PDB file of C-alpha atoms (C1' of nucleotides) and ligand atoms in Angstrom:
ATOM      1  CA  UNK A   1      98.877 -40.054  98.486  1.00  0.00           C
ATOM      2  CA  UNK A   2      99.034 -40.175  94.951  1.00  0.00           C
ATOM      3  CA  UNK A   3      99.888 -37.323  92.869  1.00  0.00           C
ATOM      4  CA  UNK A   4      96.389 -36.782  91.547  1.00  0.00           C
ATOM      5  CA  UNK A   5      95.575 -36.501  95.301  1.00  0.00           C
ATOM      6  CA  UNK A   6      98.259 -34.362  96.554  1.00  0.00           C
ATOM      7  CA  UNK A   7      96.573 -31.717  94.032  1.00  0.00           C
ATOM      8  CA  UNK A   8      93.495 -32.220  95.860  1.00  0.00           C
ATOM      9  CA  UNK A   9      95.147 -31.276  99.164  1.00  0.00           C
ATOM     10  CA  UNK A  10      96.881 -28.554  97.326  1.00  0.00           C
ATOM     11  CA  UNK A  11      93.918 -26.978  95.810  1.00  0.00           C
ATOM     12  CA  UNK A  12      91.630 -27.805  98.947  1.00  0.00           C
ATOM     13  CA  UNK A  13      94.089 -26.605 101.659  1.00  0.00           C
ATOM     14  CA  UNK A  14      95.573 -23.254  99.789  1.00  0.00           C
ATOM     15  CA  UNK A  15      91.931 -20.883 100.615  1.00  0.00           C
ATOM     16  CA  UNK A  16      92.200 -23.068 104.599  1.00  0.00           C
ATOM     17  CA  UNK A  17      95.783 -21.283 104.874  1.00  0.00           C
ATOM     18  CA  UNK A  18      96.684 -18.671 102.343  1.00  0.00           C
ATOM     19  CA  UNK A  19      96.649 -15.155 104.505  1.00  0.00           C
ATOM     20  CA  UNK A  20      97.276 -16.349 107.776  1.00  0.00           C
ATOM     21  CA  UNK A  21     100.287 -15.898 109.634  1.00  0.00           C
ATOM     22  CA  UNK A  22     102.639 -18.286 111.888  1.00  0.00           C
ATOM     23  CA  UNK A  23     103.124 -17.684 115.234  1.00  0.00           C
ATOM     24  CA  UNK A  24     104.451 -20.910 116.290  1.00  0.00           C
ATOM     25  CA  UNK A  25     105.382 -24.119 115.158  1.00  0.00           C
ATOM     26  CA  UNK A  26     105.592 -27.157 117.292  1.00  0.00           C
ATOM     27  CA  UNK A  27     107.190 -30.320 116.140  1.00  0.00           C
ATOM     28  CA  UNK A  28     106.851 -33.875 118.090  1.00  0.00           C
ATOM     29  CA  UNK A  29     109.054 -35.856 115.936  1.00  0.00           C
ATOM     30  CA  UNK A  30     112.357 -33.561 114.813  1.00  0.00           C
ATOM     31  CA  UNK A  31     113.104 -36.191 112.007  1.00  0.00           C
ATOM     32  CA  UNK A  32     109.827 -35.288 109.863  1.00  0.00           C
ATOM     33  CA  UNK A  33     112.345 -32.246 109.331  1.00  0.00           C
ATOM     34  CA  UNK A  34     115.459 -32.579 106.913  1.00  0.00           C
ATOM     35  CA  UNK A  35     116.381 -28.767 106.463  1.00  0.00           C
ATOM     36  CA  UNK A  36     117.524 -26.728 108.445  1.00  0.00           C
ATOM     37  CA  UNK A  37     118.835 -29.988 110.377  1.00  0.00           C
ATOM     38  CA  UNK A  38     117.969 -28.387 113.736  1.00  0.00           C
ATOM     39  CA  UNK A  39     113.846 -28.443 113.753  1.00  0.00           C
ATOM     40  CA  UNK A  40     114.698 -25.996 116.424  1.00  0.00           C
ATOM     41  CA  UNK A  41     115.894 -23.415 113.601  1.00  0.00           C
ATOM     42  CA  UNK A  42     113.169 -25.032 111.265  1.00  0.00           C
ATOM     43  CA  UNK A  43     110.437 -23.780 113.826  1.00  0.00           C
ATOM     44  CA  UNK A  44     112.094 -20.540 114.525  1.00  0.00           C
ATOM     45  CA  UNK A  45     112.378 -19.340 111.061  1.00  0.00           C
ATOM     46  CA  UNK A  46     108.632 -19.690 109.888  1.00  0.00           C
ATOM     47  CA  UNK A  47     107.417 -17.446 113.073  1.00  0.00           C
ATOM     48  CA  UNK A  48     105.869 -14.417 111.766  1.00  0.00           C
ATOM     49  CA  UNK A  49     105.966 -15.145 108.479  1.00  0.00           C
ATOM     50  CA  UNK A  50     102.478 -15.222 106.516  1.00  0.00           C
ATOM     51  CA  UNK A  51     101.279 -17.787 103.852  1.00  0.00           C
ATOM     52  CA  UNK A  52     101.094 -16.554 100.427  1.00  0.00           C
ATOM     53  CA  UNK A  53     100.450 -19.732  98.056  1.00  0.00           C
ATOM     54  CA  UNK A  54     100.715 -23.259  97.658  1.00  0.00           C
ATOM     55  CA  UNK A  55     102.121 -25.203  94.832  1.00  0.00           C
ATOM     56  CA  UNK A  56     102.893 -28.761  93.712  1.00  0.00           C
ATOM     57  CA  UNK A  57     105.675 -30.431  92.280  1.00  0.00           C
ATOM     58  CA  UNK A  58     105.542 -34.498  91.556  1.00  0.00           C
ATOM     59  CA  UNK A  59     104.065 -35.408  94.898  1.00  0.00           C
ATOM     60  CA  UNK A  60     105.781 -32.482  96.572  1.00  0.00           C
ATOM     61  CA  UNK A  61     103.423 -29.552  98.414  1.00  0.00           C
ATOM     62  CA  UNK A  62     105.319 -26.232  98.101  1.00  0.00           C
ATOM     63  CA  UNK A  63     104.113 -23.846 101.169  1.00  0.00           C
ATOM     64  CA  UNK A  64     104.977 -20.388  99.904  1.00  0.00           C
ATOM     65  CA  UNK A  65     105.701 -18.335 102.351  1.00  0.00           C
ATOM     66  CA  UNK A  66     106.882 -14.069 102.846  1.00  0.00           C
ATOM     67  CA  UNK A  67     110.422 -14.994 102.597  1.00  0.00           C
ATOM     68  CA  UNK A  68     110.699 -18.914 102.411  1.00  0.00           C
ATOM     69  CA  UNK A  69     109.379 -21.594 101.047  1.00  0.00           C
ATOM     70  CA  UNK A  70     108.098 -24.960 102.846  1.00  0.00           C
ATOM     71  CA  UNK A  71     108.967 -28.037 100.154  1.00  0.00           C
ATOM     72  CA  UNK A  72     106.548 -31.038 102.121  1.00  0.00           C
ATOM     73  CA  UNK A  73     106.214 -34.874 101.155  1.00  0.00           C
ATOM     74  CA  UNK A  74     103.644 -37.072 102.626  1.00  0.00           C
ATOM     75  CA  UNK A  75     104.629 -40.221 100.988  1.00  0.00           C
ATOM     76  CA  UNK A  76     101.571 -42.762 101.713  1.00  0.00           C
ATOM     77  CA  UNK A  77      99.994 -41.742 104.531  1.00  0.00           C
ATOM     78  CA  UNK A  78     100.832 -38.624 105.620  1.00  0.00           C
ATOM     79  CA  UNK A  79      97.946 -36.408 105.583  1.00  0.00           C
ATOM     80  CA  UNK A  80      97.065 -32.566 106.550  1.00  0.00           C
ATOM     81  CA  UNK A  81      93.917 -30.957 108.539  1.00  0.00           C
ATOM     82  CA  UNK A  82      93.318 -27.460 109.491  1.00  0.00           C
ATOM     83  CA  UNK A  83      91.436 -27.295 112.576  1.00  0.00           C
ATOM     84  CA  UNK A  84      91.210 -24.828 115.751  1.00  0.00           C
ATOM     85  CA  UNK A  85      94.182 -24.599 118.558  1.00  0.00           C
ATOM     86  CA  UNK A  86      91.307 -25.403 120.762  1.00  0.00           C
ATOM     87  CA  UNK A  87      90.548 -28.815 120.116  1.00  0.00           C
ATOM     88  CA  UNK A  88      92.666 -31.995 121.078  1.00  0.00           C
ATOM     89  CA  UNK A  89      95.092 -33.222 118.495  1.00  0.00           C
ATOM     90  CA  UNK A  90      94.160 -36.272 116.282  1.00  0.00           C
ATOM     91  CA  UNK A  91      96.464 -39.561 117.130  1.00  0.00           C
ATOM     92  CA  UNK A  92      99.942 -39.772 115.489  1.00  0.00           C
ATOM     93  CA  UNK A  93     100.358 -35.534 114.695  1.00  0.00           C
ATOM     94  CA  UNK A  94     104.012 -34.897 114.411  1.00  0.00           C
ATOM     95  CA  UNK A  95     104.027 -31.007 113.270  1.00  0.00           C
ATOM     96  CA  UNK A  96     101.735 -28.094 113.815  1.00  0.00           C
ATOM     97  CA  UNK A  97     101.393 -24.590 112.359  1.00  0.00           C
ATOM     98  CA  UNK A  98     100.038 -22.530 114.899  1.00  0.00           C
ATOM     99  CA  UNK A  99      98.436 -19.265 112.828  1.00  0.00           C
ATOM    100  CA  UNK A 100      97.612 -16.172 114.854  1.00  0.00           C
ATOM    101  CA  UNK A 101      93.799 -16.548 114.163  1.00  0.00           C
ATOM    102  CA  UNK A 102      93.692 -19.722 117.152  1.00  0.00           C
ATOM    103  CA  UNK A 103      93.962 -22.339 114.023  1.00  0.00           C
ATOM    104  CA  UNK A 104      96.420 -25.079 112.757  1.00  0.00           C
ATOM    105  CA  UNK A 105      97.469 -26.316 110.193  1.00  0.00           C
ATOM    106  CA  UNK A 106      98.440 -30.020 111.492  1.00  0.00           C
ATOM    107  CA  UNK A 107     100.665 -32.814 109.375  1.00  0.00           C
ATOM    108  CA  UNK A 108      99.904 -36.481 110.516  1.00  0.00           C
ATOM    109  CA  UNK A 109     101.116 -39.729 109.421  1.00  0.00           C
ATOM    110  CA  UNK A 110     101.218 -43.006 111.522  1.00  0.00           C
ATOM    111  CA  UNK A 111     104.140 -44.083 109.574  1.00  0.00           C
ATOM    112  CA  UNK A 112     105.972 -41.252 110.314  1.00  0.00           C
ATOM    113  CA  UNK A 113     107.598 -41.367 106.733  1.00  0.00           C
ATOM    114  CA  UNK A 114     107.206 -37.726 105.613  1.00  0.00           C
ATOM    115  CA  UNK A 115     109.670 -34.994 105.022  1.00  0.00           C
ATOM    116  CA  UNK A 116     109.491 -31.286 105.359  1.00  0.00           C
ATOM    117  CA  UNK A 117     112.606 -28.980 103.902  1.00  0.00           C
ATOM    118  CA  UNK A 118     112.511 -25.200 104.569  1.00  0.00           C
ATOM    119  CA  UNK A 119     114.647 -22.582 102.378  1.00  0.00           C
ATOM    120  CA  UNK A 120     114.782 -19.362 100.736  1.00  0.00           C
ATOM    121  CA  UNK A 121     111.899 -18.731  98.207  1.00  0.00           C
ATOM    122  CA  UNK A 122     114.699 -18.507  95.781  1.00  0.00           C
ATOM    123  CA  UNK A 123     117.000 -21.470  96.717  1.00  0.00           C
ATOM    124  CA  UNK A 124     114.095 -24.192  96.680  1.00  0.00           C
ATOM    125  CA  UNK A 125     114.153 -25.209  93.707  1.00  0.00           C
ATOM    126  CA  UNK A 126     118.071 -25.750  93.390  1.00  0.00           C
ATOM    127  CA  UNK A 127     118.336 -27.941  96.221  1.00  0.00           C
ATOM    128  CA  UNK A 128     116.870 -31.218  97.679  1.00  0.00           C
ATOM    129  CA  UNK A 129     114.551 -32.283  97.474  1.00  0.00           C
ATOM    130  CA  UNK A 130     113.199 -30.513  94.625  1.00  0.00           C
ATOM    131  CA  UNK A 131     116.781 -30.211  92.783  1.00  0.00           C
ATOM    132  CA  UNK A 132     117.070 -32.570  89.494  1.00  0.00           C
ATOM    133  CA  UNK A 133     113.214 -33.278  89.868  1.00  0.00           C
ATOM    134  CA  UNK A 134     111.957 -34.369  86.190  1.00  0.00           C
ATOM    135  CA  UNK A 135     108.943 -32.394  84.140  1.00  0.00           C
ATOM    136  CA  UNK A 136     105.376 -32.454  84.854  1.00  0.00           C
ATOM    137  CA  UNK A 137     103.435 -35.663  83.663  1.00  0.00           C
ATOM    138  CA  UNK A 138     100.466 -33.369  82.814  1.00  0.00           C
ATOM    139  CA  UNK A 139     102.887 -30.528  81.440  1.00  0.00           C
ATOM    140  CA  UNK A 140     104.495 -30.038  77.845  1.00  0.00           C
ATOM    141  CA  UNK A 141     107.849 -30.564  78.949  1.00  0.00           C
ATOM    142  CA  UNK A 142     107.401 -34.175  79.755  1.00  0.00           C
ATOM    143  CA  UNK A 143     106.958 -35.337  75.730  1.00  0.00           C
ATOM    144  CA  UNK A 144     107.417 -38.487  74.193  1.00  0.00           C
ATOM    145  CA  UNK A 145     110.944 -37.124  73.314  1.00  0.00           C
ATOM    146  CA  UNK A 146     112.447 -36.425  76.225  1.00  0.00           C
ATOM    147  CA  UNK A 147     111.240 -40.328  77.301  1.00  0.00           C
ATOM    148  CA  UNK A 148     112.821 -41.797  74.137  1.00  0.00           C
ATOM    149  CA  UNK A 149     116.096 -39.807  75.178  1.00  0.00           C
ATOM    150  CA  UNK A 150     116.074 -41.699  78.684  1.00  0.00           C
ATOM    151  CA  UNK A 151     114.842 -45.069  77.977  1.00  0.00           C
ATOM    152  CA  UNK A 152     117.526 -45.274  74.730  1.00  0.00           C
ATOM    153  CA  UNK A 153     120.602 -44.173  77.252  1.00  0.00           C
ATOM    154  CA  UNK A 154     119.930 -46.949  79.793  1.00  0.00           C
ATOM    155  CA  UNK A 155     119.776 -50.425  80.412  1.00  0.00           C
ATOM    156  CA  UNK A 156     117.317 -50.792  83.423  1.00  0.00           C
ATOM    157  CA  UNK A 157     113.801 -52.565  83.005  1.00  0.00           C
ATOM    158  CA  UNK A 158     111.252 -49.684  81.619  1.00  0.00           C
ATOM    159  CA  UNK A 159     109.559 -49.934  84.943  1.00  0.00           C
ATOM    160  CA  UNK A 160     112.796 -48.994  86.636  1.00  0.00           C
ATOM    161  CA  UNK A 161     112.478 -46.106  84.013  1.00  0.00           C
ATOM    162  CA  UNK A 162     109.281 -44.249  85.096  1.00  0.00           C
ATOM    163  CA  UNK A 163     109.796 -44.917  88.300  1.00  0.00           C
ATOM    164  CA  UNK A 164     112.995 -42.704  88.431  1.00  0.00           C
ATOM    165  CA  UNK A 165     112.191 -38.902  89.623  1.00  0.00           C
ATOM    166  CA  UNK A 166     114.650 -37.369  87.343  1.00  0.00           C
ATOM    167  CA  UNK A 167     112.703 -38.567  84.050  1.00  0.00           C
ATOM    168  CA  UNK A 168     109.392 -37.748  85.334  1.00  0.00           C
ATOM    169  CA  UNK A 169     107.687 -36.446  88.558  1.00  0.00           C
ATOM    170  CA  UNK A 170     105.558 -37.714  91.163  1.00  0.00           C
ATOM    171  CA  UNK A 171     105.172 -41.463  88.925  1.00  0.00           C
ATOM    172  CA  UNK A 172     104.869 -43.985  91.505  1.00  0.00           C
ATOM    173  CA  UNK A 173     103.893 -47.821  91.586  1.00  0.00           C
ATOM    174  CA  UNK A 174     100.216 -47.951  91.150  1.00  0.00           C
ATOM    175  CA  UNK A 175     100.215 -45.322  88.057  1.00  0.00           C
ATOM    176  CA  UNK A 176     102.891 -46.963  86.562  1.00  0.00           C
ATOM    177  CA  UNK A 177     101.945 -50.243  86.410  1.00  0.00           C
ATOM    178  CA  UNK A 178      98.769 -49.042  85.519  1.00  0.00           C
ATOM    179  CA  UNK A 179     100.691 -47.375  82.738  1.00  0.00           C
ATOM    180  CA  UNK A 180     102.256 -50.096  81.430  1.00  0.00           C
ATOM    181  CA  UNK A 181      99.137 -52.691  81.110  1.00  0.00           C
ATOM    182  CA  UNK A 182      97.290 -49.930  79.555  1.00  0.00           C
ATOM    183  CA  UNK A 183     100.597 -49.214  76.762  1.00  0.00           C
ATOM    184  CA  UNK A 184     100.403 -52.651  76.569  1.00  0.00           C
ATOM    185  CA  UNK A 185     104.055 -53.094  77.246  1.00  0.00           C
ATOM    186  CA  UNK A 186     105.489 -55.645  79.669  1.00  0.00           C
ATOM    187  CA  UNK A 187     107.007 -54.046  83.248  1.00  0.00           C
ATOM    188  CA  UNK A 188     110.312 -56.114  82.630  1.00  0.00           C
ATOM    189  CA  UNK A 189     110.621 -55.307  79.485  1.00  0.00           C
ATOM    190  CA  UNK A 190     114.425 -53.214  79.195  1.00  0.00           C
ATOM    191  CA  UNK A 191     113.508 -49.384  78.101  1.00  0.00           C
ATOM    192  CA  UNK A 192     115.865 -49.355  75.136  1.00  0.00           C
ATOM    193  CA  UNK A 193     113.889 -52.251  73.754  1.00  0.00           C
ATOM    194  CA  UNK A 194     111.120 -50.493  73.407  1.00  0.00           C
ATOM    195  CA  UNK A 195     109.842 -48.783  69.530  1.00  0.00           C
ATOM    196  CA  UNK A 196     109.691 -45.861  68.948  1.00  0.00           C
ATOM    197  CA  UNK A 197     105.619 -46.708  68.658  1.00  0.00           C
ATOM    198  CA  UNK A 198     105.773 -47.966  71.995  1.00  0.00           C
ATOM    199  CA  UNK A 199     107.188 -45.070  73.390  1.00  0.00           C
ATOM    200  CA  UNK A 200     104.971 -42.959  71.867  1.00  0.00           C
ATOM    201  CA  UNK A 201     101.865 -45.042  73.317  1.00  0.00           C
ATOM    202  CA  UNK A 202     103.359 -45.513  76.833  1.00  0.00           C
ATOM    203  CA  UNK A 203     103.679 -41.434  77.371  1.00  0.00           C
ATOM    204  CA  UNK A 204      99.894 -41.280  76.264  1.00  0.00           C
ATOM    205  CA  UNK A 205      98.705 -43.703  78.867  1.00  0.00           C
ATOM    206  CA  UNK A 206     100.780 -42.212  81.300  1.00  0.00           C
ATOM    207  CA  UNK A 207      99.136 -38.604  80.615  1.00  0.00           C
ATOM    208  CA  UNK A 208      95.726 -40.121  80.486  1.00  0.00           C
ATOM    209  CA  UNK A 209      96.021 -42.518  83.608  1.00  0.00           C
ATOM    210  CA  UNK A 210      97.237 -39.303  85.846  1.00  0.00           C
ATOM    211  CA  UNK A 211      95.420 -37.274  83.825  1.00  0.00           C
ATOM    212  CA  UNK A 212      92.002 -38.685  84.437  1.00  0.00           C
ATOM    213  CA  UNK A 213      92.576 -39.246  88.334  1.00  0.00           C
ATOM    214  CA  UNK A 214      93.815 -35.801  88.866  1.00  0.00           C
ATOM    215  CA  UNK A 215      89.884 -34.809  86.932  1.00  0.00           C
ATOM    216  CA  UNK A 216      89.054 -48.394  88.952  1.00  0.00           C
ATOM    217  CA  UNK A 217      92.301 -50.456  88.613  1.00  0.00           C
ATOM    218  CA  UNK A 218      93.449 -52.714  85.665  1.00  0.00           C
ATOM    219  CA  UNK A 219      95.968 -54.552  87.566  1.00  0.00           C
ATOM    220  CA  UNK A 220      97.470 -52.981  90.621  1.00  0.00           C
ATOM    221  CA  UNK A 221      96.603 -55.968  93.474  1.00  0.00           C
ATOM    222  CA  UNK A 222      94.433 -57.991  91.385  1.00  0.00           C
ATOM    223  CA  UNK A 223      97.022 -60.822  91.326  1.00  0.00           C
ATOM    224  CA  UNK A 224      95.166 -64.152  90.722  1.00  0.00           C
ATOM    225  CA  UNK A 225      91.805 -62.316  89.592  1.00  0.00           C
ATOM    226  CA  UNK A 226      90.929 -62.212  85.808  1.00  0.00           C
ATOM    227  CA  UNK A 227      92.101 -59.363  83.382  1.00  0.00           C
ATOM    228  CA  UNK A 228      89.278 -56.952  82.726  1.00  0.00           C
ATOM    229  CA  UNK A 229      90.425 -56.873  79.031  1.00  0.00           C
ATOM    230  CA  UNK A 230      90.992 -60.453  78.529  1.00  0.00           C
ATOM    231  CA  UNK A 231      90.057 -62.539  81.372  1.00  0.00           C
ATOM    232  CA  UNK A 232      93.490 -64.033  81.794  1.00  0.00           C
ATOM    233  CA  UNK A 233      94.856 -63.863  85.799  1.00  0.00           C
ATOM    234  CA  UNK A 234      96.779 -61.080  86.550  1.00  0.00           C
ATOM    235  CA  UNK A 235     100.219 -61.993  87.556  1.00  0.00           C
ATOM    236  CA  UNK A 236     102.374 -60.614  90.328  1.00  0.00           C
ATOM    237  CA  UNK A 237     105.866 -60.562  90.195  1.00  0.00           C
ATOM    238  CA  UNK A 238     108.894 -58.070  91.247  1.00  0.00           C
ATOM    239  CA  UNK A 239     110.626 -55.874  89.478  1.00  0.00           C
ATOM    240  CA  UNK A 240     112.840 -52.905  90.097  1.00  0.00           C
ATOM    241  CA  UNK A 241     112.780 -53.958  94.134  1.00  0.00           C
ATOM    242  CA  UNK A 242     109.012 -53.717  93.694  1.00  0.00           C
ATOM    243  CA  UNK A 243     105.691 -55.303  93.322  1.00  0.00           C
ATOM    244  CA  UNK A 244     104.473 -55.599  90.347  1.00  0.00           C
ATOM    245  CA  UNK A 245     101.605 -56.827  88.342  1.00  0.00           C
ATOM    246  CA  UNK A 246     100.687 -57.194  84.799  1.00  0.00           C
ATOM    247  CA  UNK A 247      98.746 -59.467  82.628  1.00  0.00           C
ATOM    248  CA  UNK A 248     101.019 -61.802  80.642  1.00  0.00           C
ATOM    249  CA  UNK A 249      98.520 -61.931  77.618  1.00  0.00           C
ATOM    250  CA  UNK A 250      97.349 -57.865  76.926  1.00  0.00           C
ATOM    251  CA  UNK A 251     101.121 -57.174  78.015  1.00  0.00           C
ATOM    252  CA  UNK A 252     104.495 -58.256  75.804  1.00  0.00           C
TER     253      UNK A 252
ATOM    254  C1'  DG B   1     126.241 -45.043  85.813  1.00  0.00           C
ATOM    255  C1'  DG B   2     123.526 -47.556  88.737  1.00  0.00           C
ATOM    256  C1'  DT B   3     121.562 -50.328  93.114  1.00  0.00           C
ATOM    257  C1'  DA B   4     120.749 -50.142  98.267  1.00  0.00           C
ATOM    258  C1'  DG B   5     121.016 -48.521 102.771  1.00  0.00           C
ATOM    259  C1'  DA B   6     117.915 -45.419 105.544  1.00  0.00           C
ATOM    260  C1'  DC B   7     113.332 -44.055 107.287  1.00  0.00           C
ATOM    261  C1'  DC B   8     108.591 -46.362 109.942  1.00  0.00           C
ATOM    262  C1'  DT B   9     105.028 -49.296 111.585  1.00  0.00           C
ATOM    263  C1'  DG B  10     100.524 -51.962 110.961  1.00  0.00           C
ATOM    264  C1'  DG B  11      99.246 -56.129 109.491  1.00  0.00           C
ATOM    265  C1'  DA B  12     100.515 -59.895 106.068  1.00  0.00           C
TER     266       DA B  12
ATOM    267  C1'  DC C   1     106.566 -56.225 103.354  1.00  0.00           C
ATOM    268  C1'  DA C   2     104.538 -51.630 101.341  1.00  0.00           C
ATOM    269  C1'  DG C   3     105.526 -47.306  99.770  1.00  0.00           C
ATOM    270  C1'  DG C   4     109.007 -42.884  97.751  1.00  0.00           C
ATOM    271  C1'  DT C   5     113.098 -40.285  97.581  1.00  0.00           C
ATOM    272  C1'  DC C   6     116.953 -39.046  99.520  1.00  0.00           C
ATOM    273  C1'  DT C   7     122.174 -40.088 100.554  1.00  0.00           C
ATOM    274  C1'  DA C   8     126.102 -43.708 100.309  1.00  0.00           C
TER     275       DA C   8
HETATM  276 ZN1   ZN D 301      94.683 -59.018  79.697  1.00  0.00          ZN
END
DNA sequence: GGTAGACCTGGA
DNA sequence: CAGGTCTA
């Protein structure tokens, strides 16, 4: 899921969970779990202790609990249900908060690409995966400044740019090609070669295009159909290891 | 400073 | 491959 999305399931599952307590945790594929590095301690730590919140951070869900906190990544297809102990689990669940009022809270994902770090309420934020994370998209600290400062001090493609988690958070393909066609700035384009102007009008797309989701494509996987500004075929091509698409004409 | 190995599997 | 974010 997309950032815009993982505040759905942040703001959808908090009044599911928030009051209820653990009394088990059962785990069906130990490498979901990064930290501890025994799921055994993972599981044993969270018993008995009740949820009090839920926050985001990029694409990261932040369980709070009494004394720790639960830092959880879905990536594409991981996806969470609260449901009653009672009923049979849906294909591919790999953990399962067991609350002491007979429900779950259940984390699938037939990919099995997730990861779920548990520490001290007060150590989260100072260690992986959470540590060096950039500013919010949507918040102040993520200005048109502190982008300049990054794309000036590098030489990788601008695309390469946004998609690194230290300069901004939770920025993945799809928004930031998005991004880039609606800036009208080419994905291949090196960072420092942007203007200052371009700079400038890249953050503000980037703010609106997450902006407006988190409240229809331009280019993601329309290769070979016609540009909805301009008609010409959007192009598909790869940059920074990844698939990307832009439309040579509205794009330079 | 980077780029890239690692993780996983359904469908190209 | 298609995805993201970590560790090497
Ligand atoms: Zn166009």
């Amino acid at each position: 899921p997309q950032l815009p999305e993982v505040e759905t399931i942040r703001r959808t599952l908090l009044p599911l969970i928030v009051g209820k307590t653990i009394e088990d945790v059962r785990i069906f594929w130990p490498n979901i779990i990064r930290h501890p590095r025994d799921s055994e301690a993972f599981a044993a730590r969270m018993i008995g202790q009740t949820v009090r919140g839920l926050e985001r951070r990029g694409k990261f869900l932040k369980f709070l609990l009494d004394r720790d906190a639960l830092i959880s990544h879905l990536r594409m297809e991981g996806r969470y249900a609260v449901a009653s102990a009672l009923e049979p689990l849906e294909p591919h669940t790999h953990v399962v908060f067991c609350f002491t009022d007979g429900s779950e809270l259940r984390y699938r994902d037939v990919r099995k690409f997730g990861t779920m770090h548990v520490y001290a309420k007060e150590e989260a934020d100072r260690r992986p995966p959470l540590a060096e994370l950039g500013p919010e998209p949507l918040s102040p600290a993520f200005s048109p400044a502190v982008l300049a400062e990054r794309a000036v001090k590098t030489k990788r493609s601008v695309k390469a740019l946004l998609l690194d988690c230290t300069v901004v958070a939770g920025f993945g393909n799809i928004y930031v090609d998005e991004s880039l066609f609606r800036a009208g700035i080419l994905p291949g384009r090196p960072a420092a070669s942007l203007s200052s102007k371009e700079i400038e009008r890249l953050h503000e797309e980037m703010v609106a295009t997450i902006g407006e989701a988190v409240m229809h494509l331009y280019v993601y996987g329309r290769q070979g159909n016609p540009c909805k500004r301009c008609g010409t075929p959007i192009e598909k091509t790869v940059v920074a290891g990844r698939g990307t698409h832009y439309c040579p004409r509205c794009q330079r």
